[PDB]
Amino acid sequence: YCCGRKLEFSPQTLCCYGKQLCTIPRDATYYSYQNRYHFCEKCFNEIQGESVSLGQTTINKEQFSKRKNDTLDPELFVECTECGRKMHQICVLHHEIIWPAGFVCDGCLKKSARTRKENKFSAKRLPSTRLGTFLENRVNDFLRRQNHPESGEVTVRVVHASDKTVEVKPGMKARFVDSGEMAESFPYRTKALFAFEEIDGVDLCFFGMHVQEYGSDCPPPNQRRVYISYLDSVHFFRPKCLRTAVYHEILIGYLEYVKKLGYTTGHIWACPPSEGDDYIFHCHPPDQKIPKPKRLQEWFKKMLDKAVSERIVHDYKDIFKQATEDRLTSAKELPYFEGDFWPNVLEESIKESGGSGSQKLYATMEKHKEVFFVIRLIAGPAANSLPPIVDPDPLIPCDLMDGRDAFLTLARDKHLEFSSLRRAQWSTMCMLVELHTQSQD
Ligand SMILES: COc1ccc(C2(C(=O)N3CCC[C@@H]3C(=O)Nc3cccc4[nH]ncc34)CCCC2)cc1
Ligand SMILES: [Zn+2]
Ligand SMILES: [Zn+2]
Ligand SMILES: [Zn+2]
């Protein structure tokens, strides 16, 4: 081999199909049918009977194969078209679409005074936006002030933007929508953006984020609000000593930008994802740990405190204090975001109380206050006389980046891990190719 290392891809984590939020981890015993419907051992033996509803066809348990999630797929090699030398495709970052003529190794390149043809499928050449330019300018200006020899050029690209609506769930709908007290749905625009760092002339995707933006056309209570759906990272930014600062620069810049457009309030649900290796990026580095809730909360506070000192954020409060200042009385006054905690808990509260949308509201808000940040961007008289929000950036149709599920599925299907610098660089290269090609159609 090339680098003298025997390399294989790790067994991934699978869903178990007989419980929402159930997964089959690596090396665990499980049952599968047609390599499509997998069941963890516990969920399988708990099914009363030997019949399993799937899809809705009923399948017998003897048709299932008993397996352990221990399959190690070896890494692929590519062969130099001149040396015959076999090298890991990931080590040399050879992509057939980028260099269709074939793989020529570095040694054969030097022995002809030759360089690889320019990678036109780069992060920088992804279409720009006013938002992405604003963010990457902030990050790169910050990095240049640090004068650290290891920092590379950072690219920020918005890769998806589409119109969506969040639907009020049945319990809140029956309580408040059917009475005409609350809009049935709330229109918003979702945006997905990613940050890339050039390391040794090679792109590395190290940050990703999806947001929901509710414009001046949105009925209350969601008007002029932005909400972070999810944020994720791969911890290989160089230098490490500027990693946290760069994340904060992106988030503060996003808040600064939406404030300029006229959004008044930002919302953050500071809740770590469940333990696992996939959130936005597939197969995180094993030594990158998910922060515990208190540390994640302090991390967001540190970011927002800097935003306050920069006069970008006027102030921020937890949901409980914010409700108290706003003199809230009913759950219909709480902003209603897609996939957020509050729509789910309000369904429970109405059911538990026998049909009230106010009973446990303040107690529930106090119980979870430290997890929910309400960020005031525009305050005072200015927040009441604002012009309509007009976004100069166009819609970006990209089904791979409409939500986080599609990109995870592509990475799983093509072994695109972010578990090491070399694999993350390869997964970044493949991800950029997909983004450049899907758009060309
Ligand atoms: C205080 O410590 C912190 C605070 C914030 C972060 C950020 C960050 O990446 N995260 C906040 C929670 C989600 C994501 C994260 O840690 N994801 C994962 C890491 C490892 C394995 C994983 N599996 N699944 C997801 C996942 C970094 C930028 C955005 C916030 C990281 C550490
Ligand atoms: Zn190698
Ligand atoms: Zn299960
Ligand atoms: Zn060669």
PDB file of C-alpha atoms and ligand atoms in Angstrom, residues 15-24 38-44, ligand 3:
ATOM      1  CA  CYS A  15     -32.073   2.659  12.446  1.00  0.00           C
ATOM      2  CA  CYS A  16     -34.228  -0.093  13.959  1.00  0.00           C
ATOM      3  CA  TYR A  17     -37.611   0.786  12.342  1.00  0.00           C
ATOM      4  CA  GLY A  18     -39.657  -0.383  15.322  1.00  0.00           C
ATOM      5  CA  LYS A  19     -39.135   2.689  17.461  1.00  0.00           C
ATOM      6  CA  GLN A  20     -38.686   6.351  16.593  1.00  0.00           C
ATOM      7  CA  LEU A  21     -35.247   7.453  17.859  1.00  0.00           C
ATOM      8  CA  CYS A  22     -34.046   3.825  18.132  1.00  0.00           C
ATOM      9  CA  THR A  23     -30.731   2.892  16.509  1.00  0.00           C
ATOM     10  CA  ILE A  24     -28.602  -0.236  16.089  1.00  0.00           C
ATOM     11  CA  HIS A  38     -33.456  -3.616  10.313  1.00  0.00           C
ATOM     12  CA  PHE A  39     -34.504  -4.367  13.898  1.00  0.00           C
ATOM     13  CA  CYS A  40     -32.450  -4.197  17.063  1.00  0.00           C
ATOM     14  CA  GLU A  41     -32.755  -7.383  19.101  1.00  0.00           C
ATOM     15  CA  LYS A  42     -34.868  -5.769  21.836  1.00  0.00           C
ATOM     16  CA  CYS A  43     -37.430  -4.216  19.486  1.00  0.00           C
ATOM     17  CA  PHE A  44     -37.642  -7.516  17.566  1.00  0.00           C
TER      18      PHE A  44
HETATM   19 ZN    ZN B   3     -34.988  -0.857  18.564  1.00  0.00          ZN
END
